[PDB]
Amino acid sequence: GDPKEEEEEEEELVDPLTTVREQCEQLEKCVKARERLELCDERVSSRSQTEEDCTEELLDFLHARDHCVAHKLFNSLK
Amino acid sequence: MLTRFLGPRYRQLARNWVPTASLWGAVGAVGLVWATDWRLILDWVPYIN
Amino acid sequence: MAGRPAVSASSRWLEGIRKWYYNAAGFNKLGLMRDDTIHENDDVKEAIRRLPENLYDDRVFRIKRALDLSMRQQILPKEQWTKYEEDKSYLEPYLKEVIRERKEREEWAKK
Amino acid sequence: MGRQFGHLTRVRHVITYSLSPFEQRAFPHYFSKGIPNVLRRTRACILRVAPPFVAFYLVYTWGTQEFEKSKRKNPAAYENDR
Amino acid sequence: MVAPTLTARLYSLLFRRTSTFALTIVVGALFFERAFDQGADAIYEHINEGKLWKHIKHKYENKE
Amino acid sequence: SDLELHPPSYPWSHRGLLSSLDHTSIRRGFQVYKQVCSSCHSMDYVAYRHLVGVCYTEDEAKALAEEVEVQDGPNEDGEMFMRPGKLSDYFPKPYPNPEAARAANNGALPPDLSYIVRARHGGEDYVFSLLTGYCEPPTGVSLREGLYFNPYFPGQAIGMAPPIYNEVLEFDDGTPATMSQVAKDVCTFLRWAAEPEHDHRKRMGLKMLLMMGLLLPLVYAMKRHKWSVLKSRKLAYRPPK
Amino acid sequence: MTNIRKSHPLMKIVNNAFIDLPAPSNISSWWNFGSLLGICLILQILTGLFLAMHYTSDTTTAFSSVTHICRDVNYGWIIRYMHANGASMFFICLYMHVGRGLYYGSYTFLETWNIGVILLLTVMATAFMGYVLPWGQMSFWGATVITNLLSAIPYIGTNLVEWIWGGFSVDKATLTRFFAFHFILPFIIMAIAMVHLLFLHETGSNNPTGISSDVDKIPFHPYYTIKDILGALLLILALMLLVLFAPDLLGDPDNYTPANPLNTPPHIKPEWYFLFAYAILRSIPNKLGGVLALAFSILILALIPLLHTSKQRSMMFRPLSQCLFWALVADLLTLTWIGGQPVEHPYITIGQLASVLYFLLILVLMPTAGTIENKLLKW
């Protein structure tokens, strides 16, 4: 699903990185880290003024997810 | 060489130590050839050709 | 009456601490007596020179075989170790006299 | 430099025997005696070597954990309800 | 020389005289160093098949 | 205190103790440099002649060098003049001085890419994660103009716009030029640009292991043979009576 | 014509110290580091001389010449890394040479031990001066913090700091001086090392037992030359393992960016063999106290022979002191670990405790350990 060739608005090989990334958002380690990210946003976004924000929980969400993709990313490449 | 004077005792001494001096120069020849791959010399050995 | 200045040491009683330390030191495993491992300074070296031939020659072999054991990183069998009770100071009487002689000589200089 | 064999010390009544290096095996009973030996040697020193370095790992496992834990924040909200 | 074991013939023939002891060292170094490189390189290129410049050269230099 | 994200340990074709560099990826990695990196990043320690025997042939590299004009050689009249580059010429510098570079960008100075693999913690793993790690800034941040959020960059605020995307360039051999694939080739190239000795480093390493693996048991045998006299030595004490 | 009476009226009589020298039979492997240290000197000088044939001390072309060594010179990449990792192997060998003397009481050789400390100081000066040669933002800034410590000296600090610097700060003037100084000092070490042996061969060597080994001396030539050759190979294997499989494992990655006085590195730190001394200096907030503690910790070796208390020389039969010796080694590793970490609240507390324990052990606990056992052995 992207603009390379054939019908369906063409077919550019969607990046395998995107496919692998969503393959690990359902893992237990990554959903719980994403879970803490959601509650952080509600506290910060609804806050009128406060210096806290939500990248540390994002970083933990990234750390779990980005370690997964390294395991099974280079197989699809080349 | 390997002697002191010109006498039968030293002539026997020189002859007795010729085979060792004979093969000692091989180390000086082959070893130097081995060190810098003397081509003219390395072109005659069959396995190293 | 041994071990530590306290009447009772940490690991019960007082005399057994020195016995425990002797086995911990491990110079008996090599077949050496206590005075065979002493540091040889200008004092002890003279006190060795006064040893009787029967006792000095015995010390030489005990050291000689210990270095053989240390060279091979080995120890003597369990029955050939130096018993703590049977270990006797063959050099203390000679050391004491050199202590007495050196003390008199040193103190006589300052007068 | 100085001294040499001949005047080192006075050694008496000691007989030594030795073999030619070509008439004896270089590796005699390597694993039959060396392995039981190393176990004996290690035990004689593991009670004086291991505890000092075991403590360092405990410092490592706590000093490192504290550093990251201190880096992690704590809630500091002053007035709000989510 | 007159023994049915290889090393006895290997010693008396060569190692008996130190002059020929050095000959086997220098000549042995010639044959060892030549075979070791080929031995230790062929294994290296097996680990890296289709990786180095030697294995992807063939699709270049036009007619060569 | 601006917590740092640890780069993941991406497996590589050259991660093993004896694994070598994928020279096919190096050639594709250079295509990223000559089209994307070279626009605003410099590489002043790698020449056009270094690519000979690594990723391009001698004729291929001469064409690459002559493709870019270089300024060198005082004319007999005493003035500078342009000329096509040669093999000996280093990669062109996008800007003459760092001050011009800070003017071209939002003050940030693009680091030299010659050693950027070995001059950063994590090596190619951090660089690969940095190139592909760009993400939308989280709620509650305030990024100045000309600044983008990249968690793998220390401070989580990098001055580099995302330089890699799908079909940003086209590869000669035709592999899918995707965000992840393109970042891998340039990371493979950036390692070679940093450690050209990488292949020979392991090639001599294998020979040393096969040498020390044989000499050490042999040298030990000489030690035991000479010391077997003292190891098998019996002492007897026979004092008189 | 007496084969034993060789070409004596020549330099071979000196070489009798290498062939016919009496040596204890029970010499362990920890003694091999003496010969390894000499090989480290020869290796460092051999690779150093060939490095100096392409290195240029000018600031504008110092870092670029190091790149030219690896990138352009045939086989020049390995020589740069056997030099960078030879210093790592040097201080690995140097610290076990000191440790063996601590354990086996070799400091009773007062002349040799004192020359040993002088030898130690000379190498750490050479290693520090050579680290500034690549000029790579770790060279410039590692030298900046350490050299600025001399400004804490009262009434003469800034006078000699500039006299070291050749200017108001580390610059090209300092860089040229270091390369010339880095060239001369290793040849001084050879002369001192010859003097180091001269004060030892007169009194012989030491044994793990600690007793006199005059009754069981063996010739050096057939037994220890082949023992040192095996020890040399284990050094070459270990050094070559770093060079060919992890050349930058020990060196900091930040050193590969050219020195920039306007920009500071994310973390400032010396090489791994000085990190143990960095922690001690960082322990005390005071500036004058920190530099003194840095020097005292290195110079405390000369004070060790005056602290001996036990009637036994080696620690072989001193179990109480053995527990303390490995506590000191572990603490020295704690100082090394905490030296490379930023100064924050967990490492501030641990840093002070490790440093205060480093001096407390040697100054108080170790001499008290010898006294306790002396009472425990009826003497």
Ligand code: HEC
């Ligand atoms: C838009 C111009 C531009 C492009 C094109 C570009 N860069 Fe950058 N790059 C920069 C700037 C500016 C910085 C410095 C940002 C800073 O230091 O805040 C930088 C920084 C970097 C760094 C250093 C990051 C660090 O933490 O030190 C690396 C590595 C890098 N770029 C790699 C690349 C690669 C690979 C490419 C090609 C895909 C590329 N860059 C293309 C402008 C560019």
Ligand code: HEM
């Ligand atoms: C005991 C002797 C020596 C020691 C401990 C020593 C130590 C060092 C160290 C640690 C470095 C840093 C290298 C790096 O971090 O990249 C270095 C660099 C250097 N040394 Fe020495 N060195 C010694 C002797 C010599 C000698 C005798 C010479 C020249 C004759 C020399 C020439 C150089 C040069 C040119 C450099 C810079 C090149 C480079 O860093 O790779 N060194 N030295």
Ligand code: HEM
């Ligand atoms: C480049 C530096 C050095 C070199 C080349 C060197 C060389 C040597 C050698 C070859 C020996 C004899 C080997 C042996 O007996 O095991 C020795 C002995 C000794 N050295 Fe050094 N040394 C150096 C630095 C040091 C240092 C840093 C110390 C620190 C205390 C030191 C103290 C001693 C002592 C105590 C001995 C006694 C050996 C014994 O008791 O048998 N030396 N030195």
